[PDB]
Amino acid sequence: QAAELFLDTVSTFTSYELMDYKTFVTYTVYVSMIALERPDLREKVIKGAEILEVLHSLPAVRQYLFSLYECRYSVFFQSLAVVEQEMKKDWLFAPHYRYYVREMRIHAYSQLLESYRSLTLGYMAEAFGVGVEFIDQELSRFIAAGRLHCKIDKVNEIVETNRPDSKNWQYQETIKKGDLLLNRVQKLSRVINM
Amino acid sequence: DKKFHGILDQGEGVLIIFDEPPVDKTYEAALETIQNMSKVVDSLYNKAKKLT
Amino acid sequence: AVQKVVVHPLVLLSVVDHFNRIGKVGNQKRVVGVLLGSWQKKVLDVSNSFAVPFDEDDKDDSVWFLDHDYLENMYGMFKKVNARERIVGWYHTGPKLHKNDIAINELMKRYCPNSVLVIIDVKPKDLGLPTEAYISVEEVHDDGTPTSKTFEHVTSEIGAEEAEEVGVEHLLRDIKDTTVGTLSQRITNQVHGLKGLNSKLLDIRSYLEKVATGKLPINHQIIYQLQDVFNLLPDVSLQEFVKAFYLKTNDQMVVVYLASLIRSVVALHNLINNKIANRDAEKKEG
Amino acid sequence: LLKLFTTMELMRWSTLVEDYGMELRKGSLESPATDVFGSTEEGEKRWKDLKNRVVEHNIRIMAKYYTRITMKRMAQLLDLSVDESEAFLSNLVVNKTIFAKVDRLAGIINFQRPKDPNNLLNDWSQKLNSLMSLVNKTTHLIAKEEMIHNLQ
Amino acid sequence: TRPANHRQLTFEEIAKSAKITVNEVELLVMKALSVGLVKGSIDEVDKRVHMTWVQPRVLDLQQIKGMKDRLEFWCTDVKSMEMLVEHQAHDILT
Amino acid sequence: IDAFRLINANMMVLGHEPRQTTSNLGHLNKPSIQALIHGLNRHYYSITINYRKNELEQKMLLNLHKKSWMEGLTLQDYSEHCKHNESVVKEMLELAKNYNKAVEEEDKMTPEQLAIKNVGKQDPKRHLEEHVDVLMTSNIVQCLAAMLDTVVFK
Description:
The structure is cut from a larger assembly and holds chains A (194 residues), B (52 residues), C (286 residues), D (152 residues), E (94 residues) and F (154 residues).
Chain A: H1 2-5, H2 21-30, H3 41-45, H4 50-57, H5 59-69, H6 73-87, H7 100-113, E1 116-119, H8 133-143, E2 159-160, H9 168-191
Antiparallel strand pairs in A: 1-2
Helix pairs in contact in A: 5-6
Chain C: E1 5-7, H1 11-20, E2 32-37, E3 44-46, E4 49-51, E5 55-56, E6 64-65, H2 68-81, E7 86-93, H3 101-107, E8 116-120, E9 132-135, E10 152-154, E11 156-158, H4 162-172, H5 185-213, H6 220-230, H7 242-285
Parallel strand pairs in C: 1-3, 1-11, 7-8
Antiparallel strand pairs in C: 2-4, 2-7, 5-6, 8-9, 9-10
Chain D: H1 13-19, H2 21-24, H3 33-36, H4 41-65, E1 68-70, H5 71-77, H6 82-94, E2 108-110, H7 117-129, H8 134-150
PDB class: hydrolase
Keywords: Proteosome, hydrolase
Entry title: Cryo-EM structures and dynamics of substrate-engaged human 26S proteasome
């Protein structure tokens, strides 16, 4: 909902009714990557005009989008830390300092684990960033979180994914919405009948 | 960018092109019927609560 | 080159009529008449017909009499009242056919080039057995076997007309068998759809054990006609059925899973509205 | 001509160049034979195009009478190397005229397609229906027709 | 010889029976598919030939015997399943 | 179809089809307004029609018209069977969109159990389960029809 109504940004004069325009640019660009992954996200944050000029004004934000779009994960690693130290100098960043990081971290992993089903971490030692054992315990915390449907392997160095084929994921969506309704209809069925 | 159908391998350097099943219509239409049956029972719940 | 025939539901009623038009004094126990038809392009159609006096003595089984003058006038009378209908052949009843049926056929081919016969059943009517038709063909026999007739079978169907189908529904008035069935007629269509299955399969081994013994001589024609049945039935092994059968079985269990969901909310809502209306009439009666 | 109709009729270009060379060399009349083949670079291209048309006939017979084949067998049966065989098939498949797909990791060019579970089960019941009902009706009625000829 | 049990026959059995070499079993079966005595296919990832025999002939009384026993099995399996359907769905038959 | 029959004009001071013997002559024929204007009953009269139905004519009439052999054990050819179920789920989807607001708004605004939602409406709990009723009979049969041939045909 935040990224939907922040899509129309046609207001330049700042008044009683409007905040600082520069910080309104940073707010509408930090949120426009969580709503939609890539259903032509490049049309609304890159092919725009009034948002493209003001991100062309700022060096870090223009670095931040290009690092996410062209998949320069080595500098997207750095550009996320520069934003997050900047996050402390805000008056509304309280559900952001611990939730916007781990969502953007798991979004960078998810598009990286796309297009690769036999990915090795020996390629992760230079493409995503540096290090070896940090990525292993990082991916292990997210696979055990329930998210990032992929498997990890140590003694063969193959991060073999097991992403579903738009059927077994869709099979889960009937069985999760089904019994949630079934527990609702029995609880309805017992309040009545005395 | 969905301009190509396939998958890559880093452990072997093997490009594999595969196909996908259709997007089938009959399944996720039934996903939306569950959302309606979830709301009418919610409509029956506060109805049965407000008057017994 | 006959694909199939179309027998309207009028002519067999005329046979059942003429099966009773002789049984008061006749002991002929067969009815032979003249079949009229409308040969359109390739499929055959039968609209009207009539009968003809015919007898047959069991001694020497080669003596017959047809009435040609009655055939010349009455077909000529039908042409005047309807210049659409013409001759297509003949018919007789009785399952066991006598052997003058080649002698009857080869005479009246001077009327009809593609002469055809239709065998009906008046008494064998208990199981599922329709009318039967053959064709007049002249070959030697097969390759090096002595010459004969060998009436080949042509498949048959039943088709009505617009008034001939609506007038039927007004006559029955007893069960009427409605269209698309509510789970009771459809299972019986699989019940008596299978009661005729093994009745054919008992009949195959009955002729087979008759010829496995060797009383009657063999026909090579039926052998390979039976042999391509057994090496063309499917064999369900792996990845062609057991994968693809569940792909449509776990498909069709999703939509009947709505019937579990929806119909339970239907009768629950009818329970609430009655239990509201019950207690409110109860609390306000006193 | 009758050999190159269809069904391969035991064709091979190395066998074709060795038996009909006398027709391509001097013969009795041989007057249009020198006029078409056996010439300068106009004629030499017609050797290559005749080589091109027979192997195009040799791919069509493989994709109809086979399911899978190793790439080493296809190369030696076309009297040419493995690189030309891949590039010649790659010319045909972008031309959407021969419908197949190769493997350069294990060398199995296959000829069929991954069939659909709706398609496969419908083709299962279709071979179930027309092969076990119509001829099943025919077995009952020929055995009824033999009741007349046999007895009595 | 094999009544459609495992009709996928490998190259060794044709090379033994027809006493033909392995380099000619492929040319042998394409000639048979050309005439019309069979309508199978040829796989070489396992070097096994799939066979859908469609050209029937005469047989003896010895193949008649096992044909009846398969038919008697065919008879008693269909009749047993009709008795399971007629007993189960009798109350909804009408 | 009907049959009629002329009456004489001399007996027009006494009964015309008189002399009630039975009481079955009243419910077998009821002449409509278009019939009693031309000749009924001063010119002719009507007569009753029954149908002489017996055996070996009537039973074999239905033993040949509405019969089948392989119709029960034949697949519905899933190229259009499951394609048909797409356009049935989506339309009861929309009726479930219609059903959500309708009853609960009617009950929470006025409890009259009456007007225009009673006099000229069509979206009750009669319309939403008959699509479920069709969808079961078309599929429970079609599921079980593909179960027999797995056993019967090897």
